[PDB]
């Protein structure tokens, strides 16, 4: 197959943030890592001034600033998810900004089990080394010197296999790590010294001490204090050897603290963000002893107020704090000495739009296509209306998690599945609790699921239906069925109990929203979770646990089973085209079914037998089936045209592979441009808020753009010196192959921005530059 993938909206979720002096010795810089993007801001009188935004050929997992001795300004260390390590330097020579790759390498190991808590990258305070926790039982040390241009690292065996979090401590004569680990005896905190010349671990300054069961975060405190602050679930502790200081404030019991940031350079004040979005300030009280040394007297936590749910926090300057969110919009907030009379010392200054996570979306015409996405989660959950302008985004906050969306044109309303958390009592007012009209279904923290009928124009919750206790709503469709002229809202549900592995119960509830009212038209009791539902030629195609069932709508306004298919593990996704059905499995990739109208049953055509942990499926055409899996890869499967035997004909062949670097949640047919080298248009929405487009090209077009990819890869310089072929290579923990049948549209589009001499070098002996500029412009206009 020949496919063209291009980013329409860059990822918006913030995965990392740091402050330092990177662009110059005087500039105060905020660096933000959004997956594959690195943004550099200068803190100024007017706020954050962006100076350079860069794209990397990798998923940024570590991003740390450090200043070696003799360096006039901070150097950056970046590690990617594909273990591409680079030491970068910001270089400015007058109106020209370059990110110089001081050092680059790949620090992956041939053998190694990736750690549960993920890649950890820490830097020694004296910049003697970079430590990487990549695999269980292996601590990778990269010595920092001017001669180690290749990042020639070495591994030290770590006895503690289950390490939770590790930092380098301050004020140690030798490089020292302090980490929290789990063993059969619980969770503990331990220290080691690293010897570069000996290439080994030595005993830490202070012996191990037992910590909380859910101790999850390590904070290395600067001098004068030294030591570390361990943060868990319901306690905060400080360990500096003989000095142990634990507190258990009730205020932190309600939510888990997920991020921290040091405010004062001496470590007397810290910011702590929790999962509910609450911002606390940890305070370390000083005690200057008469001996001349400074010790810690007490720990205090104060509720500063409420922010966006923080993935990361960073104090910039003058009481201003950047809050980088992946579940909601990021924000600059201001800390004030005096409260707002509401008891809150935090005042929001600026909001940065984040579309992540995009759990579902749809294309509507409210001849110009608009995307409506279910974005965010919990109090950050909202609807996002994206249209071409570049992209214009309108936010409709729901204050609860949206899960599914379907447009009902005849009713001029959207149907949205939503969930809220109650303790029952709701934790805050939300869309489901502030509906104009509300109803409840007839026949610790709990999830309450609702169907919201929301006005298309005002985006106000017209109605909210509360489903049964322990009932989760999974699938939603707006369609007409059979001979019934009414358009219905069909919801697939599942009763959830801890006693059950698979749901033994579930429901298909058919509602009608008419005259600004919601009534339950029909209720069907099924024996499992209704994962997916599609309107299939006037009939209702549903997936219930491991079965795909086609129902008919009778004249009595009830569903009657027409046919069943059982050859699935867990039919999560369903797409249809004509009489074809694409069944996405939990692990068994994609299956092609053909409904047979003359037999009234399903027929299996071909299954992709490569195990793929599917996250979203789509049908490109009758032959091509596009799928996304949880290792951030896209694949395209075809029916084997050269199949001569039946066994060959039972196989869907993976003819296209491509490492996207994004976790695709939803595929939809539609375009954001007004109604060309490419045919077709499929939008996809991902966890990080990135939105992409997949199109199809012919043989000649694909060949030309692949040759251009090769030429551009030869010409274009990569940040971190990562090869584009390596980055786009299909990659799981099991299998790695080069990308096939996929043109990286971003690479091709980048051709228009290179210098004309570089254009001539690229198109030399291909063909003038003007024709190919026209080609790339036509590609852009899709």
């Amino acid at each position: 197959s020949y496919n063209y993938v291009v980013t329409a909206q860059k990822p918006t979720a913030v995965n990392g943030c740091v402050t330092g002096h990177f662009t110059s010795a005087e500039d105060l810089n905020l660096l933000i890592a959004k997956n594959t993007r690195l943004e550099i801001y200068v803190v100024t009188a007017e706020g954050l001034r962006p100076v350079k935004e860069v794209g990397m050929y990798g998923k940024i997992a570590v991003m740390e600033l450090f200043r070696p001795k003799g360096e006039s300004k901070d150097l950056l260390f970046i590690l990617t998810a594909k273990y591409n390590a680079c030491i970068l330097e910001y270089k400015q020579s007058g109106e020209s900004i370059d990110i110089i790759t001081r050092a680059h390498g790949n620090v992956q190991d041939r053998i190694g089990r990736p750690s549960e808590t993920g890649i950890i990258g820490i830097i020694d305070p004296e910049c003697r080394m970079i430590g990487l926790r990549l695999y269980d039982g292996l601590f990778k040390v990269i010595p920092l010197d001017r001669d180690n241009k290749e990042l020639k690292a070495f591994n030290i065996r770590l006895e503690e296999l289950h390490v939770i979090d590790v930092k380098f401590l301050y004020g140690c004569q030798a490089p020292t790590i302090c980490f929290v680990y789990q063993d059969p005896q619980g969770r503990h905190v331990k220290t080691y010294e690293v010897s570069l010349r000996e290439k080994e671990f030595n005993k830490g300054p202070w012996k191990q001490e037992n910590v909380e069961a859910e101790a999850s975060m390590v904070i290395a405190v600067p001098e004068p204090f030294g030591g570390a602050i361990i943060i868990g679930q319901e306690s905060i502790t400080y360990h500096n050897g003989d000095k142990y200081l634990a507190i258990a404030p009730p205020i932190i019991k309600q939510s888990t603290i997920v991020c921290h940031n040091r405010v004062d350079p001496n470590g007397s004040r810290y910011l702590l963000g929790d999962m509910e979005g609450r911002l606390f300030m940890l305070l370390l009280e000083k005690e200057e002893q008469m001996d001349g040394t400074v010790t810690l007297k007490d720990l205090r936590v104060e509720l500063l107020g409420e922010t966006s749910i923080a993935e990361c926090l960073t104090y910039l300057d003058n009481g201003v704090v950047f809050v980088g969110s992946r579940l909601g919009d990021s924000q600059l907030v201001k800390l004030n000495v005096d409260s707002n009379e509401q008891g809150s010392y935090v005042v929001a200054m600026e909001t940065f739009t984040n579309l992540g996570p995009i759990v579902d979306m749809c294309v509507v015409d409210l001849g110009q296509g608009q995307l409506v996405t279910c974005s965010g989660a919990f109090k950050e959950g909202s609807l996002r209306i994206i249209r071409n302008g570049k992209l214009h985004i309108r936010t409709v906050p729901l204050y609860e998690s949206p899960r599914k969306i379907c447009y009902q044109e005849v009713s001029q309303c959207f149907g949205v599945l939503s969930s809220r958390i109650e303790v029952t009592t709701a934790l805050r007012p939300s869309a489901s609790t502030q509906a104009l009209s509300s109803s409840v279904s007839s026949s610790e923290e709990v999830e309450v699921h609702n169907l919201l009928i929301i006005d298309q124009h005002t985006f106000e919750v017209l109605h909210a239906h509360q489903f049964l206790q322990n009932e989760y709503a999974l699938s939603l469709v707006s369609c007409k069925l059979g001979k019934d002229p009414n358009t219905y809202f069909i919801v697939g549900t599942a009763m959830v109990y801890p006693e059950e592995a698979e749901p033994k119960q579930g429901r298909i509830v058919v509602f009608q929203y008419s005259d600004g009212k919601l009534q339950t038209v029909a209720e069907k009791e099924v024996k499992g979770a209704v994962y997916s539902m599609v309107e299939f030629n006037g009939k209702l195609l549903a997936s219930i646990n491991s079965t795909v069932r086609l129902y008919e709508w009778t004249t009595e306004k009830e569903l009657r089973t027409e046919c069943n298919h059982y050859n699935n593990i867990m039919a999560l996704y369903l797409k249809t085209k004509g009489d074809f059905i694409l069944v996405g499995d939990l692990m068994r990739s994609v299956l092609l079914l053909a409904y047979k109208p003359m037999e009234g049953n399903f027929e299996e055509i071909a299954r992709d037998f490569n195990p793929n942990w599917m996250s979203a499926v789509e049908i490109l055409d009758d032959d091509n089936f596009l799928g996304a899996e949880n290792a951030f890869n896209l694949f395209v499967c075809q029916k084997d045209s050269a199949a001569t035997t039946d066994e060959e004909r039972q196989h869907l062949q993976e003819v296209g592979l491509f490492h996207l670097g994004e976790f695709v949640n939803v595929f939809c047919h539609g375009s954001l441009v007004m109604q060309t080298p490419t045919q077709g248009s499929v939008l996809f929405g991902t966890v990080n808020g990135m939105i992409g487009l997949v199109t199809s090209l012919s043989e000649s077009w694909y060949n030309l753009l692949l040759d251009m990819q090769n030429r551009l890869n030869k010409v274009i310089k990569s940040v971190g010196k990562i090869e584009h072929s390596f980055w786009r290579s299909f990659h799981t923990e099991r299998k790695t192959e080069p990308a096939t049948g996929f043109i990286d549209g971003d690479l091709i589009e980048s051709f228009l921005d290179i210098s004309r001499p570089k254009m001539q070098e690229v198109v030399a002996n291909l063909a003038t530059a003007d024709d190919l500029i026209k080609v790339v412009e036509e590609l852009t206009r899709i």
Partner: peptide
């Protein structure tokens, strides 16, 4: 009121002044 937010670090007092 909040004596623990009194002395928040200042790198440059001009920063965020003209927000």
């Amino acid at each position: 009121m909040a004596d623990f937010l009194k002395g928040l670090p200042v790198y440059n007092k001009s920063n965020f002044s003209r927000f």
